[PDB]
Amino acid sequence: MFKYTRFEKARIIGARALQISMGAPVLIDVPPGITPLEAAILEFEKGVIPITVIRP
Amino acid sequence: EGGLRFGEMERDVLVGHGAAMLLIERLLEESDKTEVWVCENCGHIALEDKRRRRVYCPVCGEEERISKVEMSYAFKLLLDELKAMVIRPKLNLSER
Amino acid sequence: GYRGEKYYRNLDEDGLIFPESKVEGKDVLVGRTSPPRFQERRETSVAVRPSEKGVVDKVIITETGDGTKLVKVTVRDLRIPELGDK
Amino acid sequence: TVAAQSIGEPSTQMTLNTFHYAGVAEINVTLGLPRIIEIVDARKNPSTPMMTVYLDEEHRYDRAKA
Amino acid sequence: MYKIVTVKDVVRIPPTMFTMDPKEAAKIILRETYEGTYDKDEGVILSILEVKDIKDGIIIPGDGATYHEVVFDVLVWEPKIHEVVEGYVADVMPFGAFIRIGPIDGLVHISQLMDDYVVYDERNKQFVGKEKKYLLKIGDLVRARIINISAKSKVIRENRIGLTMRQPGLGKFEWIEKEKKKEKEEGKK
Amino acid sequence: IGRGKLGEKYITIAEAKELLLKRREEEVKAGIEEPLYYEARLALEHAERFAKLPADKAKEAVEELMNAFEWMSDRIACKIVDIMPEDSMDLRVIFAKEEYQPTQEEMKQILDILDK
Amino acid sequence: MKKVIGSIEFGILSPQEIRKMSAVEVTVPDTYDDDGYPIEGGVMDKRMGVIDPGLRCETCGGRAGECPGHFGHIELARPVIHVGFAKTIYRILESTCRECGRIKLTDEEIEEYMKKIELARNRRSEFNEIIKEIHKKAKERMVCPHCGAPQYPIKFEKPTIYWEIRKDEQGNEYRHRLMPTEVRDWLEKIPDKDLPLLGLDPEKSRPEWMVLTVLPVPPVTARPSITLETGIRAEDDLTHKLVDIIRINNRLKQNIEAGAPQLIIEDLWDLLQYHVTTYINNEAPGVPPAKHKSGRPLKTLAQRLKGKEGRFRGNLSGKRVNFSARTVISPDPMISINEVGVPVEVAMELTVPEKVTEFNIERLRKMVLNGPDKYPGANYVIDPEGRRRRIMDSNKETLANQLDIGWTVERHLMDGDIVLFNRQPSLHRMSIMAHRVRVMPYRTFRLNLAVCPPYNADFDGDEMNLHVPQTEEAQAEARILMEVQNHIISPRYGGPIIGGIQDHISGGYLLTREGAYFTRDEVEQMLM
Amino acid sequence: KSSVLARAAFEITVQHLFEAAEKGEVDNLNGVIENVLIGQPVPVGTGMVKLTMKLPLRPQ
């Protein structure tokens, strides 16, 4: 997006990790044995993010 | 087998970092989880009936609207202690 | 309140631990049952502290001032220096 | 919270007991922790009220006029 | 009595259904929650027909699922007092006949059955006619006014409906035919 | 029902028998053991007990009842279409269901429309 | 589908609300019977709840934990004055009139005060200033504007005593001792239109309610009883105070019914008022604190809330926490600055719940197979239904096979996990940071030496606490916001804080000093 | 501070509680301390971020 503050990045990664843990599929191939959180960081770094942030 | 103390200073530190959900997890989630029903016009703690399988307001006599709210055991006890005196805390409910 | 069978494993039939036996934590040293008065019997044994360990050194049987029984047990533990010792 | 901690953490470092000696050409003033506490609590009158009077264009360069 | 209403609400879509279209998942969830339940102010919720449109989702902290506000319509059988209901009678019981008034079954008291002295069968167990020998059969429908609405809880089977039969224009179709014949005789004379 | 009410529509039981049939076909093609869930086939029997009125023609009778006279509400037309009060005394009976009893020439035109 | 508390409106209670709220009237001044079995109508009545195992309450039933506790009530024989509202009662009495109960204010003054009080009513300080001005103007008056009656001056005593100087012969103005009954009659006649001028709303604060008629009894869970060594069942001080109130007001009712000389009735009234005063506030000024058997003042409701160890602070603000450990710290320069050496023993105890997904089924299955005694293992397994099982050598293989998508495994700590590392006291923000885990054999936390200046720690016996977040959002916040390398620059002065100390600087000087030269082997060895 | 609970937590709890009861004040819970007491997210840092997402996620 335009620019992601620290809090917004943390929130997005946390939400994606929770969704992945609860059963959501991963849209990026990942190495075996990774925790859901690190899968979320890999997904964010790849740039594919499905969660947008609402600004006032 | 006691637990370590997470005092007020640690609370201010965690606020300063800006980690709200971490604060929630360290404070409430792992200690004193609670659920409470409250009527939507008095705010008094609604009294559930295990015999009749129906929640109701004893003070208010209400059953049309009763909601279930998560809270801490300490806060529930503080409300009870305030009601021990003549202090009446009226709870206004809202939906997220 | 009867804990695991392995906890009372080195007590003699009188209810006292054998000297020079090995304890490792939560192990019963003196087996004692209290009356159910707050057809049962409450378990009120005296056990090692949960995080400690050692060997039983001596067991003393005395008659206290009131005329009842009193038992004192000491557990010794070897402490070789390690990381963190001051 | 960051500002409060930034003001409070160094507070464990200043000497609550200052020099307490004006010496020569000076006036003793509360320093360190007590001065900061007095400033923050906004006491109606400070412990050592000391003023600073800068001279006008005249009498400034002249010691006698000073 | 059958009626359809349009209601807005918010639906919690679990992450497991994140790969299907929002409308179908919302329909499934709504079918799960708002169905087979009697509303105190509306009646018995029967079926979600279709969700008109779905908005975006909100990630509430601590949950991980998306909450979408939605508008949809549902058909509901709504009881109302003082109305005629043409239901299948059944399960006649020495205090009241049980009329299948829809998803819920309604009760017709033994006294309400007939203007004549209160009568109900014991061996045959449907209806003994003391004076007018007007009989009711389980396989026969009757039309009856309402005297009371029982609105107890969300569940349906707890509640009931009180229907009267004494009032004119209501009865077994045979009794209705007899009353119509009497009216024709009176109007021809 | 949840927050917010956005209107209502009063529909004849013959206007929902086909909706129940849609549920019927949907669930059987879905392979569900029950053709439709509880409290629904019990309503289906009631629907089919007087399902003889065509749904589309039922709605035509409704709209003719609206355009016939202005004191008409779709629930009233619904019940008249359901029960066919071809007898005048019966129509007085439904008139008693209403708060007031209007002109009986209007009942003549309800008899006219009921012949659809 | 859950709701949240959006706002709270504080108000004063009412006797009718007390009567409706309570489920039992406690008349018997007894706590317990033989072999338990609480006395019906006693201070430990099962109607208010159940605390001990094996019994059910009556209002809601269920186990001791299931019962939330329910309120009782005690109907006092004669009204008494609440301690907290004593000063407010005094101000109201010395401001309002005695006959009509109206404020001693003129109509136009009332109008102008109405206009200004609503204007900018948000700020509390100006509101209190207006209240004080109105109180002073009301007090300065002598004759009530509405009725020509002499408002005699009223005096207040610290232990909630009011004795106004009622008119005496020759205008001596004898100090008639006011009783709570006549004060109640005074307050009830006050109208509601001018209530806002007195700083009181007409809905949740009625001046009549300010004087007690029936007081509630805290639930049994709120007043727990702890069994002593010999099963004394030593209850909370609240229970003892309640027993005292019940006995005193019982005897007061008896002597009221008997119609004894009213002097004894007044004495019992004073005793009951003092007892209620101690119950509401044991430290209230002007009364002797009620000590226990060993000469210790009882900790009543007022002291329970206040204090460092009181309810408000130290109990909701801070509390003991789960999933935490504490041990001494030893240096280790061979790990990265964002890592902490964790003893293998701590890792076996602290756990991180992990949900079984497609990409980590193999590792979780293997670690479940490892059991709870080998290091890379697990302790508990949570099935999708919700019930929690414990890993044991008898059911290791079966549990490992039953593992599938949706299950939860409480695994041991692993390398790369994120934890919270804290040192007390926590002066600034950097006192808590997030380090990655690296398991080590011995029994002390290992911390990189360049990270000492933030924690302000020295390896001379210091101890530090470690916290393990359990939820995914908490882990993400710890990983993104509180990583060690993110806090190299201090927020106090904008300069570095995590830098070299001591040997780092000295060795740098030794290495880059003039005349220093190194051979081939030294160069290769130090570079490697 | 407008919040009653925030002031009570700091100092002089009982007097502030009784004064608020007399005045019938309302606490809107817009601070850190009250939200901490009730166990709801504080309105700073990550507690102020609002997120939305499109449901029809395509795994790709």
Ligand SMILES: [Mg+2]
């Ligand atoms: Mg040190």
Ligand SMILES: [Zn+2]
């Ligand atoms: Zn209520």
Ligand SMILES: [Zn+2]
């Ligand atoms: Zn209970």
Ligand SMILES: [Zn+2]
């Ligand atoms: Zn007057």
